[PDB]
Amino acid sequence: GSGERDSREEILKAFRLFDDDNSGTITIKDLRRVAKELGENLTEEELQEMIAEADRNDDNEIDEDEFIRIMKKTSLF
């Protein structure tokens, strides 16, 4: 009985931390920013693969639902 006290919260924290540009969605720019900050100098292509893996909206930004989905998918949360 997690309910309130659920992985959803942690996902949402990660979503916010990722969404540096505060689009309410995680963009390629956000992913690059995150990656660079961690040290991961990821390419356009690498990022677009990640994008495409999560994106089912065809807008190029990972929305909360998509993020939740892939976070579950990958056992990230």
Binding site: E40, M50, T74, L76
Partner: peptide
């Protein structure tokens, strides 16, 4: 397995445990 290799990046961003 591209799927795995790509998922590994999402994994790595958050699981960036120092390394």
């Amino acid at each position: 397995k591209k799927r795995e290799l790509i998922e590994s990046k999402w994994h790595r961003l958050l699981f960036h445990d120092k390394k």
